[PDB]
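Quick one: sequence plus platinum (II) ion SMILES, need structure tokens.
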Amino acid sequence: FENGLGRTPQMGWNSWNHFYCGINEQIIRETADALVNTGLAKLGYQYVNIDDCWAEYSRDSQGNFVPNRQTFPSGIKALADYVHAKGLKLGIYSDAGSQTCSNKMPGSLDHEEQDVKTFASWGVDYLKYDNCNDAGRSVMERYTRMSNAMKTYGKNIFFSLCEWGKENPATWAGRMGNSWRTTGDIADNWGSMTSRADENDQWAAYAGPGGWNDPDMLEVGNGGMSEAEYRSHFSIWALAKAPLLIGCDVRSMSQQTKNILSNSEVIAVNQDSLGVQGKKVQSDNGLEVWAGPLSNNRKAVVLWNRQSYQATITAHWSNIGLAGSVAVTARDLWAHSSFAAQGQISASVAPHDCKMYVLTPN
Ligand SMILES: OC[C@H]1O[C@@H](O)[C@H](O)[C@@H](O)[C@H]1O
Ligand SMILES: [Pt+2]
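Reply:
Sure thing.
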């Protein structure tokens, strides 16, 4: 999508993974405060995105969305002003259908232009567009309608498509938006997170500046996985140029949660100027190696132990894009230490944990 937005994957927060339909303006305002106070905003997490359940069940007499009078009494415009004053951006959610997936508010089908104009007037900076209640109309028709409305009335609004990988969006969504969900919903558990990563991985070649594969919102900090599993989750999402939308309650994070989300070296891989999605390059009995190119001839590498026991994983130069005769300085992103390497890197990796490195050629 050539709208000057999403030149790098979007970074922010989304209310769904932790709050689901139980969201309100107080939570959004406090979340904005938290992103700033915790230092996350400075690291790049700028989008404060509201998901489902923010509007009234019905539109007003003019056919416009109405912020939920119970949970968002102050309105979206006021909320956007609040967030903007904090140096952040505000995201909203709608659906390419008659109602959102929760069936608690309207969708924008046949109201695309009016809704985008409304969002723009409110100061909305991002739109996640779901796929429920399609009224028997095609994915391409419904999304094309909103794409057109956005390109004309919402030029400064990031466009996130959410149609769960139906019809292989990686092969066409880039001409319609800035990112597209490639899979069904992620859940806060190991099986879900790993399968989302695997499914998203097959579309690596289609990702690039302006159009990203979206393996869904981060579950880091929600309690369903271990610290090791979350470290791998964050590392892989970063390497895969996935959107980095925090999904936990950033107002009450543990130090462990903050440490994972706050690793600027890992974030830098996700935000790399080359904008290439890293992918799985080695997979031997659950011991995997994921890698991809970075700017200035560098490489990003993740050793991921998907087994239940401690194991040694070895990343071979030939599999990560380097000639065997290339000496480099390896940077362990989680240990925050540098060392010399050539030919390969071997390391003992903990169960479900990982090792992440950036290789800088000598
Ligand atoms: O109802 C809200 C819920 O709807 C689903 O369709 C999306 O995939 C989720 O990410 C979330 O937005
Ligand atoms: Pt299309």
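The two ends are 36 Å apart (CA to CA). The chain has two domains: 1-274, 275-362.
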